[PDB]
Structures are given as structure tokens and as C-alpha cells.
């Protein structure tokens, strides 16, 4: 907690991720809102005003964010990262930890940009997801060439306050992007559809959404707290001849499992593809 | 609390509820009794390790408790009601957890023995074991108003709980009753996808489960429609919208509708066989 | 109360789009038909005779359109654009605003052709759709290298009189083409099929067509005027256990959503593919 | 001067009341709506509009000259039993309920007074923006002036025409359910825009504008929708490529399936009701 005593955090970009992390960080009480600064060229988005009401300092100028922050989150779309790196590269100092949240963007490409300005930029690449907004995020991070050993420890302590966090090799991160980065969108789709199923069978929509979301939350918590395999927990629910095993059969007949595999694969591949376009 | 709880049936649900109740601190384990004809099942051993009183005699459980949970398989319910119908006192609240079984069929059995049985019907799910269950309940003909309030206070300690009209319960069964099994299937598949793309299985399972937990929590804590939360994730041209497309191309949404429908219909069908 | 009293408009091309815009502008009262000129090598066209009955001036000679006009719409098929630019490039004056409506054709390619004749051509690229003919179009536009700020404001005023209009970065226009440019065709296909459904269930075809079109119009208007997500508006229609949620299930079972995604993607990709062939040439 | 009542204070009552007041045909405070659940969001919107709210259906009847039945179809018989003795010769009774026949309504009401004036209608939520699609059929005792009055009233919030009653279940499957098909389609078109690089807000706006413009074009054209489609697609172009992938998925057949499924379910529900 001495890490966060006087630490200042900044976000280049003031959109969904910046709000989600800033909301989670302040809710966890690890950072006061006034120690957080965000910059965006369009202060007309719904997220810029939400950060304002939160007590986060805003500015149009990315150089202002760099001069204020000790830990600097890059929270812009991936194709903007090289433009921002050209713009504020001469402003990065030895004190800075540069934490890239951008999907696909490699540590190598960031270090190559910044190293033209100062020889030893401290860079950390991260992949998280929007549920950090409720402190139930899923975060992985990889440390760059010049990151100090306390840099990774500090980063893990920070991202652990808003969910699961663990260090990985960088070559896992595109796959993590396809699973837990895109994950929430798959769950929101499933919950919308489960609610439609409830409505089709006679439930009011508000109740069907509440029950479906509670069912998913509880099942996920069960798995996280169990040493048993997912299939064994499935078997615990399914009584012989009963309703659940009948419903599992219709999922299997539609290739339900294969669709989710397809989704992780497609997101991972698109992530890889976007970065190959970027480097080329 | 001076409250004594009993379980007829000492299987998965009895363990999940007793584990949840005691973890919530609303019941002491020694004030709980559970009965089963096979005193050597694994759930029986798990209940015993928790401190629960176990016995093979369903009459013992009835005489022990004030709130009596029926946690046997649905086809066993009529057998149980004939066995212990003569032992039901004015003090008892009988809470049937059995899928499909109607309040009418329970009240009909018990009323041959003593008028005005106090009956509650509930549908819950296994995540009460981690205090994140989803529970609905319907009050019977002779349940008093405080009976419903007491059961909601009790079941709210282990998850979401709300009162419903009984004719919603077979549909709830198909959604949140069977729901966890849909989620375990999806988590297994998502982890397979992670492994295909290079992740160790243990990490893929942890991330998939955490993603689903976080997304469910976001929706429960947001006023927004799940479609809008979906919109907020997917950036234009990005990985997430590409993945959502392959889900749509397979009819993902329709499979989940199919599942809730099939579970509900099977629940209705099974009770129609019981009535005949 | 808008009126461009000093603006002369010309169309290179006198086909479906020129008619739809000329009809929309004149109905909007922002231009008098006799201040519009259109050219085409085929005066034996249904659209040419329609433009004539509005009062639009017609000529077979593209140079005459250029000499008459201030704002010059390029309303020919995309592969004709380079030929057109070679033909009248020497006739472009300082006063001209060249507005290309051609699918896929880049500002860069237009400016490169015209700059060989006179530096600083003022070019605007737009993508619109046929419902401008009923003043409910969906239009986006992007300003070129030498377009002045008043040129884009003026074009947004003009094009806002026949529907929605906003400025975009040019790299969005091929995707807009696939959504709102091709979109009316998706809708006409859907309405034909919904009417077939009405007829199967016992409705006369005329009534089925009227009701299906009115349902789509009303729903689109509800979404445009609502702050709610399309999914929430969908939830408000369906009664539990009811007819609508039964019908939504059969759409989902066929991958209905995926087909519309497929369509937008296919139109955008084809639009990009065609321009790549043009610029290889 | 006309006083209007709604039995039921949900989505349809709100949409109609918002449309009528936006059209200037009724004062909000000349509308009264009743519901037992005075805690719905629709009830709060109605109260903010200035509509009179009461839990008592009898009060709505006594207030109204024109009385809309806006409860769920399975509620109509209980409603008719409850306030049948309160329907007067002056009332026009307009049922909006999906599937429910004039014959079933007249049978209940005629046990009280001999000649109840009944009109059946099917409409849709876009009356809220005064672009509804409405049909109606006149009952046995409805006067010629009653049909003209209802057409005038419902034409203030969209298209309105008289039909024979045997068309109304089919209308329900087309324009009654229709807006939901369009909302699903608009959500998916926006995902398509986002997949190809557009911001979600812009994609939603463009998709909705394209659909609105195209429907207006057809309503204002004598040409067949296939001919309007032909006018968009140039040879070898983007639009005809996209039309091909729609055809390859059976896009047309899915919309036929939807109209049929909604119509069949509407008939199936009413067969269940009249069986009871
Ligand atoms: N939303 C999500 O689900 C997650 C997103 N991410 C990553 O975070 C990054 C942003 O994601 P979102 O926040 O969803 O994007 P977003 O589009 O919601 O916000 C992006 C922000 O960048 C700002 N911006 C644009 N140009 C800028 C510039 N030149 N200088 C400074 N700010 C500028 C925009 O104004 C906007 O505020 C992406 O790289 C994405 O991969 C990672 C994890 C989850
Ligand atoms: N496990 C679940 O996912 C949920 C189960 N339920 C309902 O709870 C009931 C049981 O569910 P599970 O516990 O999964 O079944 P289970 O089979 O794990 O437990 C069944 C128990 O009943 C006992 N039993 C059999 N005959 C008996 C008798 N004559 N007297 C006393 N005990 C007897 C068995 O020995 C066993 O301990 C079913 O009606 C089910 O629908 C409801 C919600 C969730
Ligand atoms: N119709 C639509 O749905 C929309 C069309 N557009 C664009 O507008 C342009 C034209 O579209 P349509 O009007 O549908 O084509 P169209 O084929 O109806 O009319 C094209 C016109 O170009 C004329 N033409 C051919 N060679 C010419 C030349 N050398 N000089 C002058 N005129 C010549 C033809 O005689 C015809 O009048 C295309 O680039 C298309 O992408 C853009 C948005 C919507
Ligand atoms: N929502 C739509 O898209 C359209 C609905 N309809 C028809 O309108 C009727 C209702 O539709 P929604 O308003 O969507 O239902 P809704 O469920 O939103 O509201 C129904 C209202 O009935 C009230 N209600 C329940 N029991 C009652 C009773 N005994 N006395 C008085 N009110 C009672 C409920 O509290 C609620 O306010 C249905 O028959 C439906 O078929 C027809 C055309 C379009
Ligand atoms: O195992 C089954 O099939 C039944 S058990 C009670 C809730 C879920 S359905
Ligand atoms: O018809 C096509 O293929 C082109 S022109 C119509 C709108 C944009 S795409």
C-alpha cells in the first residue's frame, strides 16, 4: 500500500476502459480520484463526463497527462498507439511506467518507438476487461525489457484491486484477448438469449434477466471455488431422465461447444491479424 | 435463532443448502438434521463432516425440525408424504424443493392426515453452496403471511430470492434451475478454445470463469440492457465483433432459447406423468 | 426558410441518383428546378424524361453542365468517373465544388485527375441513398484537400434538406456504403418477404405490403426518437409466452442476425475490391 | 370532449396515450388507466404525462366513453366478468388484445346488457411516434358512427383501416409483431456496420434512417418492392453481392417463418382460451 501512497496515474484516452479502470480503482480505495488524470481530444463522449463527476482531472492535452502521471495507461484504440507514441515520446522519463492496454500491440513496437527518445523505457503490456468496473476483472500482464522488478509487483498489486491478475509471457496475451478480453460480450449475448428463452416460456423480462444473470454468476463462482472438473459439476446438476439433461442435449445438437471455441479462435486471430497490419 | 431445519433427502441439494446456510451464519450446523436410507453416500459423509445430524428415519427429521425441506427426487415425493403425513404438526412449514411437483399435489397428500398443512414450493439451484443461488418460491393455500417472509429471509442468505406465482416455477426451472449446467458446458468449451489458441488449461479455465462472473455481475449492477453492455465492449472492426459474428452465424442465441424451452417442457411433461 | 439563391447545381449523369436528388432538392424548396442542369449520352431514359417534367435543364454535353454549374455532382457509375474527369477537367474553374457520389471512388483519385489541369480542385466525396427522393436519405460526406470550410458547411446544408447528413472521415465511407447505401435494397427484400408471409396467412397482397412497410417505418422512427437500445424496444413488444417471442425464436434459429451482418460486410468488401481494381488500372 | 379509459396500464396503454396526446386529439387528464400493479414503469410514465391512474377497473369504466381493453389476452375474461355489469349503452368497447374474438367478448357482455358496442383492433407500439399500423373490425352492435369514430381516432396516430375480423390474427403476425422483427434487424445491421469499422452510434443512426427512408419510398411508390430493389443494385456492384448472401441464407424464408409463427401462436392461444 506504500506503492500507492503518493502515486499518480494517468490515462491516454478517456473511453470505456479508462472509465472502467478509474471507477474500479477508486471504488477499491487504492487511488483517490484527484490523483487520476485522463486526456481525450473529444470531451463530448459519455465517458468524459462520467470521469468528471467521479472527480478525475481531465484535459485535452496528452502531454499534460504524461507530466502528471507516474503510471501511464495507454487506453486508446490500437491503431492510435504509434501516433500517441510519436506525440509524447519526448516526454517519457525514467520515472514513467508505460502500461499499454491496447489489444494486439506488442511490447517490442512500443519499446522501439520510445527507445528512439530515451534508452530504457519501462513498458508493461496488459489485457483486462470491462468488469474491472465492478472489481471483478480478469487481467494478465507481461513485463517489458526495462521494467524493473518492483514494476511488475506494483502493477500486479494495482490490477489485483479490481479483479483477478497474473503475470504471463507476452505470447499468451492475444489468446487471453480472445477468451477473457472478449469474454464479457459473449456472456452478454448469452444472457440476452437466456432471457428471451425465459420470456418465451412465460416469465416477465425483468425477472428472466435477473435469474439468468444470477445463474451465470453463481455457476462461475462455483467453478472458481471447486477443484472438480466442469463436466463433473455438470453431472451434479443432471438427474437421470430429467429436465437439465434434456436441455443439454439440444445445446449439443446445435454444436454449442463448437460455437464458443469458434469465438475464442476468431477473436484471437483477428487480434493477431490487426497487429500484423500495424507492424507492416 | 431457535430455528430447527430438517432435510428429507441427504443429497446434492441438501448439502448445498446446509453448506450455504451455515456459511451465511443463519443456522448452526447442529440445529440441522438430514435423513437418507443410505447412510453411506458421499453427500451424507460431507454433511456429517459439516456437523449436521444424520439419521435413516424420515420420522426423526420431522420430529426434529420446524422448517422441513423436501429434498428427494420428484418421483419420491409422494412416497415421502405418505410416510410422514401423520407426523406433520401445526408448527411445521413444509418446503418442497422438488422440480415439477405442484403445491396442490402436496397439499392433497398431507390434507388426508391433518387439515391446513403449511406448504411452500421453491425452485433454487446448486450455487447456494457459494451463497450465490437464484431462488423463487410460491406460498400454499394455508401458508401464513409470516411463513413467506421467513422463507424469503432464510433463502436470501444464500442468493437472490423472490416470491412468484406458482405457474412461473416450471419456466424458472428451465432458466436458473438448469442454468448452471448450461454455464458449466459453456465454460468447458471456452477453456477448450483458450487451449486451442495456446493457453494452459488451468489458466484458460480461470480466465473463462472469471470473465463470466464479472460480466454477470456487471449486468446485475447496471441499469443498462445487455445489448448495450455488449456494444460497449466491441470496438469497430475489432476482435470482439468478429467473434460475435461467428456466434451469430451458428445461431448461438437460438440454442440457449432451445435449452430453456426444452428444460421447461420436460419439467411440465414429468409432472403430467406424475398426475396420471 | 433556406434557399441557395446564387447556387447553380449540375449533374454529370441523369440516372436514378440524379433524379432522386433533384426531386428531393426541388421538393425541399431549396433549389428551383430550372437552376439545375443534368447531362447524359442517353436522352431515351425514364429518368431523363422525369427530370424534364420537373423542369430540370437537360443536355447531352457534359461541358455544358460544367459551364452552367457551381456545385457539380458526379452521378455516373464508378468506372465512368475517370473518363468524365478527363473530359471536363480542363473546364473546372476556381468556383466549382465537385461532389462525387460514386461508390468507392476516392478523393485522392479525383484530385489526381483534376490537378493535372488546374491546381487546388475543391472536391467533396459523399455517399447517400435513394430515399433522398422522399427527403429521408442517409448521407455522409468527406471534404478533400482543397475544400474550404464553407464548402463542407454548404454541402451539409444542401444535403440536410433531403435527409440525415453528417461529415465523416473518408475511410468510413466504404462501410457506410455497405450499411445505408445498400440498406434500402435489404429493406425492399425484407418487405417483399414479410408481405409473402402476410399473404400465406390470409391477407390480400396490397394490405400486407402496406402494413409491412408501415411497421418498418414506425419501428425505425421509434428507434431514431428513442434513447433506448433496439433490444429494449424489442423487449417492450414481446408478451411472455406470446406470439412475438415465438416469432423471434424462429428468426434466431435461422441466424437472421448473422445474415444482415453478412450483407453489410459483403457490400463493404465488394466496394473496396472494386476500387482496388480501379486503382490497379 | 371524449373521455377515454384503458383497462391495463402497460406498454400499449402508454404508447396509445402518448400518441393520442401528442396528436392533440385528447387531453392527458381526460385519459384514465387502471392496473392492480401501480408500481410498473409504464404506470409512472403515464402519471408523468398527466393521465389519471386508479387501481379500480370500475372507476375506469365509469370515467370512459371509449374504453380500451389493454390487458393480456388471458386476463380479458376475468376483466369482462368484473366490470360487465358496469358497461352502459353509451360505451364503445375497443379490445386490443391479441387473438381475442369479438364473439367471446360479446358473449360475456351480453349477459348484462343486450347490445354491447364492441370493436376489435390490432395495432402496434409505433403509435407512440404517431406511425402505428392499425386495423379494426366492428362487432354485432357497433353503429356505423362507432366504426367511423374509431377510424378517426386511430388514424391520428398512424395508418388505420377497417378489416374483416378473420384477417386480424394474420395482421398480428405481420404488423403487430413487426416492430420486434425490425428492432432485431436494426441491431444486427448496426453490428454489421461496427464489424466494418463504423462507431456504434453512427451505425445505429444510419441503419435506422436507411430503413425509415426505404419504407417511406415504398409507401409513396406504385412500384413493386422488387423494382425498387432493382433500382439500387448496379451490375456487378456492392448491393447485388450483398443481396446474394442474404438469399444464400434463406433471408426471405425467415421472415415468412416469423409472420406464420406469430399468427399461428395467436390462433393457438385463442383456441386454448375458448377451450376453457
Ligand atoms: N472496452 C473493453 O472491453 C476493453 C478495451 N481494451 C483496450 O483499450 C483501448 C481502448 O478501448 P475503449 O476504451 O473501449 O476505446 P473507447 O473508444 O471507448 O475510448 C477510446 C478513447 O481514446 C480517445 N482518443 C482518440 N484519439 C486520441 C488521441 N489522439 N489522444 C488521446 N485520446 C484519444 C477517444 O476519444 C476515446 O475517449 C483499446 O486499445 C482496446 O483494445 C482492453 C480491454 C477491454
Ligand atoms: N441438485 C440440483 O441441481 C437441484 C435439485 N433440486 C431438487 O431437489 C431434489 C433432489 O435434488 P438432488 O439433491 O440433486 O438429488 P440427489 O439424488 O443428490 O439426493 C437425493 C437424495 O434423496 C435420498 N432419498 C431417496 N429415497 C429417500 C427416501 N425414501 N427418504 C429420504 N431420502 C431419500 C437419496 O438417498 C439421496 O440422498 C430433486 O427433487 C431436485 O429436483 C432443486 C433445485 C436444484
Ligand atoms: N442509385 C443508388 O442507389 C445510389 C447510387 N449512387 C452512385 O451514383 C452513381 C450513379 O448511380 P445510378 O444513378 O444508380 O446510375 P444510373 O445507371 O441510374 O445512371 C447513370 C447515368 O450515367 C449516365 N452516363 C453514362 N456514361 C456517361 C458519360 N460519359 N457522361 C455522362 N453521363 C453518363 C447514364 O446515361 C445514366 O444516366 C454511381 O456511382 C452510384 O454508386 C450512390 C448512392 C445511391
Ligand atoms: N405491446 C404491444 O406491442 C402491443 C400489445 N397489444 C395487446 O395489448 C394488451 C397488453 O399489451 P401490453 O400493454 O404489452 O401488456 P403489459 O403487460 O405491458 O401491461 C399489461 C397491463 O395489464 C395490467 N393488468 C393485469 N391484470 C389486470 C387487471 N385484472 N385489471 C387491470 N389491469 C390489469 C398489468 O398490470 C399491466 O399494466 C395485450 O393483449 C397485447 O396483445 C396489441 C398491440 C401491440
Ligand atoms: O436435474 C434436473 O434435470 C432437474 S433438478 C432441479 C432444477 C434443475 S432441473
Ligand atoms: O448499387 C450498388 O451496388 C452501389 S450504388 C447503391 C448504394 C451504394 S452501392
- Residue for grid cell 453481392: D241
Beta-ladder partners of A38: A11, A58
Nearest residue to A71 via CA among A102, A40, A39, A36? A36
D22 touches chain C (CB under 8 A): no
* CA distance linking residue C15 with residue C19, whole number of Å: 6
Sign of CA pseudo-dihedral B104, B108, B109, B111: positive
Q: C135 and C102 in contact (C-beta within 8 Å)?
A: no
- B59 in Cβ contact with B87 (< 8 Å): yes
C-alpha cell belonging to residue D87: 358497461
Residue from D193, D233, D235, D242 whose mutation best tests the ligand 6 pocket (most atoms within 8 A of CB):
D233
The SS3 call for residue C180 is helix
Q: Which residues contact A241 (CB under 8 A, 6 or more apart)?
A: B270
Please tell me the distance from the alpha carbon of residue A154 to that of residue B31, in angstroms, as a whole number. Answer: 47
For residue C111, how far is the Cα from the chain centroid? 21
* Pocket residue to mutate for ligand 4, from C239, C243, C245, C247, most atoms within 8 A of Cβ: C239
DSSP H helices, C73-148, are: 81-88, 107-115
Are the CB atoms for A181 and B190 separated by under 8 Å? no
Strands D117-122 and D132-138 turn out to be antiparallel
Distances (CA, A) of A12 to A28, A85, B116, D198: 21, 10, 68, 22
Residues with CB under 6 A from ligand 6: C 103, 129, 177, 181-182; D 232-234, 237-239
- Give the whole-angstrom CA distance, residue A199 versus residue A209: 9
Residue C5 grid coordinates: 439563391
In terms of C-beta density within 10 A (0-12 exposed, 13-18 middle, 19 or more buried), how is residue C59 classed? Answer: middle
> Using a CB-CB distance cutoff of 8 angstroms, which residues of chain D are in contact with residue B244?
191
C38 secondary structure, DSSP code: E
* CA B85 remoteness from chain centre: 25
CA distance linking residue C78 with residue A78, whole number of Å: 33
Q: C35 to each of C5, C32, C57, how far by Cα in Å?
A: 9, 6, 8
User: What is residue D249's three-state secondary structure?
Assistant: coil
- Which one-letter DSSP state was computed for residue C146? S
Q: What is the DSSP letter of A276?
A: H
Distance between CA atoms of residues A244 and D185, nearest Å: 32
Residue B239 near residue A178 (C-beta atoms within 8 A) = yes
Query: CA A235 → CA A232, A242, B274, C127, D134, distances in Å?
Result: 5, 12, 24, 56, 51
Which of D228, D201, D16, D128 lies closest to C218 in space, CA to CA?
Answer: D128
Grid coordinates standing for A270?
Answer: 483477428
C253 vs B contacts (CB less than 8 Å): 251, 254, 258
Distance of CA D115 to the CA centre of its chain: 26
Grid cell in block for residue B89: 404438526
Q: Which of B111, B125, B171 is nearest to B20 (CA)?
A: B125
Q: Is the dihedral of CA D6, D11, D14, D18 positive or negative?
A: negative
- Contact B98/B74 with Cβ under 8 angstroms? yes
Q: Is B232 annotated in some ligand binding site?
A: yes
What's the length of chain C?
Answer: 281
Of A181, D9, A112, residue with least CA distance to B194: A181
The DSSP call for residue A240 is T
Q: Give which of C52, C20, C18 is closest to C34, Cα–Cα.
A: C52
C-alpha distance from residue A37 to each of A8, A12, A41, D100, D189 (Å)? 8, 9, 14, 61, 36
H or E stretch including D135?
strand D132-138
Distance, CA of A161 to chain centre: 13
**Angle at CA D224, nearest 5°, toward D218 and D225?**
60
d(CA C65, CA C57): 9
Report d(CA A38, CA A19) in Å as an integer. 9
Q: How far apart are CA A46 and CA B173, in angstroms?
A: 39
C-alpha cell belonging to residue A223: 467453478
CA C249, CA C234: separation in Å to the nearest integer?
13
What's the rounded Cα separation, in Å, for the pair B170 and C189? 40
Atom of ligand 1 nearest to the CA of B234: 3
CA distances from D49 to D13, D30, D45, D53, D158 (A): 12, 11, 6, 11, 20
DSSP state of C181: I
Residues 170-199 on D with a CB inside 8 Å of C are 170-193, 195-198
Contacts of D134 (CB under 8 A, 6+ apart): D121, D122, D123, D124, D127, D154, D155, D157, D158, D159, D160, D161
**Packing angle between helix C183-200 and helix D225-232, nearest 10 degrees?**
160
CB proximity list for A54: less than 8 A, separation 6 or greater: A22, A23, A26, A33
Q: Cα(D13)–Cα(D31) distance, rounded to whole angstroms?
A: 10
Cell numbers linked to C167: 461529415
> Three-class SS of residue A161?
coil
Residue B126: left if φ>0, alpha if ψ -120 to 50, beta else—which one?
alpha
Rounded to 10°, the helix B239-249/C256-280 angle is 130
What is the Cα–Cα distance from C75 to B7, expressed in whole angstroms? 79
Beta pairing partners, B135 = B161
B11 annotated to bind ligand: yes
- Could you tell me which of C18, C65, C21 has the C-alpha nearest to residue C160? C21
Q: Which three cell numbers stand for residue A159?
A: 490490477
Q: What separation in angstroms does the CA of D258 have from each of C126, C201, C230, D265? A: 37, 11, 18, 11
Q: Kindly report the number of other CB atoms within 10 A of residue D84's CB atom.
A: 17
**Contact yes or no for C7/C70 (Cβ under 8 A):** yes
CA angle D242, D248, D251 (to 5 degrees): 80
Beta-carbon contacts of C190 under 8 Å, excluding residues fewer than 6 positions away, are: C216, D185, D251, D255
User: Determination method here?
Assistant: X-ray
Task: Report yes or no: C236 and D125 within 8 Å, Cβ to Cβ.
Answer: yes
**How many Cβ atoms are within 10 Å of A234's Cβ, its own excluded?**
22
Instruction: Note the maximum CA span of chain A.
Output: 68
Say whether residue C241 is in contact with chain A using an 8 A CB cutoff.
Answer: yes
CA–CA dist A33, A37 (Å, integer)? 8
For residues B152 and B163, the answer to whether their CB atoms sit within 8 Å is: yes
Number of H helices and E strands in chain C, helices first, is 12, 8
Burial of B137 (0-12, 13-18, 19+ CB in 10 A): buried
CA dihedral A208, A212, A215, A218 (to 10 degrees): -120
Range D101-110, long-range pairs (CB < 8 A, 24+ positions):
D101/D165, D101/D270, D101/D274, D102/D137, D102/D139, D102/D140, D102/D165, D104/D76, D104/D77, D104/D273, D104/D274, D105/D69, D105/D76, D105/D80, D105/D139, D106/D139, D106/D140, D106/D141, D108/D77, D108/D80, D108/D81, D108/D84, D109/D80, D109/D84
C-alpha angle with apex B206: B202 to B209, nearest 5 degrees?
A: 135
Separation of alpha carbons B154 and C218, rounded Å: 48
C16-28 and C46-54 helices cross at what angle (nearest 10)? 20
Give the separation between CA A72 and CA A98, rounded to whole angstroms.
5
Cα distance between residue B133 and residue B126, in whole Å? 7
Is residue A137 within 8 A of residue A74, CB to CB? The reply is no
Question: Is residue D142 helix, strand or coil?
Answer: coil
User: Would you say C13 is a known binding-site residue?
Assistant: yes
Q: Closest Cα partner for D154 from D218, D96, D72, D219?
A: D96
Q: Kind of pairing, strands C57-59 and C36-39?
A: parallel
- CB-based burial label for B112 (10 Å; 0-12, 13-18, 19+): exposed
E strand or H helix that includes residue A139: strand A137-143
* Residue in the structure block whose three cell numbers are 448472401: D245
Is B239 labelled as part of a ligand binding site?
yes
Give the distance, in angstroms, between the CA of residue A266 and the centroid of all CA atoms in the same chain.
Answer: 18
Among A192, A201, A205, A277, which would you mutate to test the C interface (most chain C Cβ atoms within 10 Å of its Cβ)?
A: A205
3-state secondary structure of A251: helix
Contact present, A55 and A45 (Cβ < 8 Å):
no
What b/e readout covers C215-225, taking b as 16+ CB neighbours within 10 angstroms? bbbbbbbbbbe
Cβ contacts of B227 on chain D, cutoff 8 Å:
187
Give chain B as a 3 state SS string. CCCCEEEECCCHHHHHHHHHHHHHCCCCHHHEEEECCCCCCHHHHHHHHHCCEEECCHHHHHHHCCEEEECCCHHHHHHHHHHHHHHCCCCCEEEECCCCCCHHHHHHHHHCCCCCCCEEEEECCHHHHHCCEEEEEEECCCCCHHHHHHHHHHHHCCEEEEECCHHHHHHHHHHHHCHHHHHHHHHHHHHHHHHHCCCCHHHHHHHHHHHHHHHHHHHHHCCCCHHHHHHHHCCCCCHHHHHHHHHHHCCHHHHHHHHHHHHHHHHHHHHHHHHC
Q: Which residues contact A89 (CB under 8 A, 6 or more apart)?
A: A113, A114, A116, A117
Sheet holding A36-39, edge to edge: A57-59, A36-39, A9-12, A71-74, A97-100, A122-127, A137-143, A163-167
Measured from the CB, is residue A22 less than 6 Å from ligand 1? Answer: no
Q: How many residues does chain A have?
A: 280
Q: In what order do the strands lie in the sheet with B5-8?
A: B53-55, B32-35, B5-8, B67-70, B93-96, B119-123, B133-139, B159-163
Q: In degrees, to the nearest 5, what angle opens at C-alpha D244 toward C-alphas D241 and D249?
A: 140
In sequence order, what are the beta bridge partners of B8? B35, B70
Q: Which chains touch D (3 or more CB pairs under 8 A)?
A: B, C
User: What resolution, expressed in A, was reported for this entry?
Assistant: 1.8
Q: What is the layout of strands, in order, in the sheet containing C163-167?
A: C57-59, C36-39, C9-12, C71-74, C97-100, C122-127, C137-143, C163-167
- The torsion defined by the Cα of D71, D72, D75 and D80, in degrees rounded to 10, comes to 40
CA distances from D73 to D87, D101, D105 (A): 19, 10, 11
Output b/e per residue, C154-168; b: 16+ Cβ within 10 A: bbbebbbbbbbbeeb
Under a CB-based contact definition with an 8 Å cutoff, are residues B186 and B273 in contact? no
Q: Which residues contact A163 (CB under 8 A, 6 or more apart)?
A: A24, A128, A131, A132, A135, A136, A137, A138, A139, B210, B214
Residue A215 to residue B252, Cβ atoms within 8 A: no
Cα B178 versus chain centre, distance = 9
Amino acid at each position: 500500500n506504500l506503492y500507492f501512497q503518493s502515486m499518480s496515474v494517468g490515462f491516454i484516452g478517456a473511453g470505456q476502459l479508462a472509465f472502467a479502470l478509474a471507477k474500479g480503482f477508486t471504488a477499491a480505495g487504492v487511488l483517490a480520484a484527484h490523483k487520476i488524470m485522463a486526456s481525450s481530444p473529444d470531451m463530448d463522449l459519455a465517458t468524459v463526463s462520467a470521469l468528471r463527476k467521479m472527480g478525475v482531472k481531465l484535459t485535452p492535452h496528452n502531454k499534460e497527462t504524461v507530466q502528471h502521471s507516474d503510471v501511464l495507461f495507454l487506453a486508446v484504440k490500437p491503431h492510435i498507439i504509434p501516433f500517441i507514441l510519436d506525440e509524447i515520446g519526448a516526454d517519457i522519463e525514467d520515472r514513467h511506467i508505460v502500461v499499454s492496454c491496447a489489444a494486439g500491440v506488442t511490447i517490442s513496437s512500443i519499446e522501439k518507438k520510445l527507445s528512439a527518445f530515451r534508452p530504457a523505457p519501462r513498458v508493461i503490456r496488459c489485457m483486462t476487461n470491462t468488469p474491472v468496473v465492478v472489481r471483478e476483472g480478469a487481467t494478465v500482464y507481461a513485463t517489458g525489457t526495462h521494467a524493473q522488478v518492483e514494476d511488475g509487483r506494483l502493477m500486479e498489486q494495482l490490477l489485483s484491486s479490481v479483479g483477478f491478475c497474473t503475470e504471463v509471457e507476452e505470447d499468451l496475451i492475444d489468446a487471453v484477448t480472445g477468451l477473457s478480453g472478449s469474454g464479457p460480450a459473449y456472456a452478454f449475448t448469452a444472457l440476452d438469449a437466456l432471457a428471451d428463452g425465459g420470456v418465451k416460456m412465460g416469465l416477465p423480462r425483468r425477472l428472466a434477466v435477473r435469474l439468468g444473470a444470477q445463474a451465470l454468476l453463481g455457476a462461475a463462482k462455483m467453478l472458481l471455488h471447486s477443484e472438480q472438473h466442469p463436466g463433473q459439476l455438470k453431472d451434479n446438476v443432471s438427474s437421470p431422465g430429467g429436465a437439465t439433461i434434456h436441455a443439454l442435449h439440444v445445446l449439443e445438437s446445435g454444436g454449442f461447444r463448437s460455437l464458443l471455441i469458434n469465438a475464442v479462435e476468431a477473436s484471437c486471430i483477428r487480434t493477431r491479424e490487426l497487429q500484423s497490419m500495424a507492424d507492416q
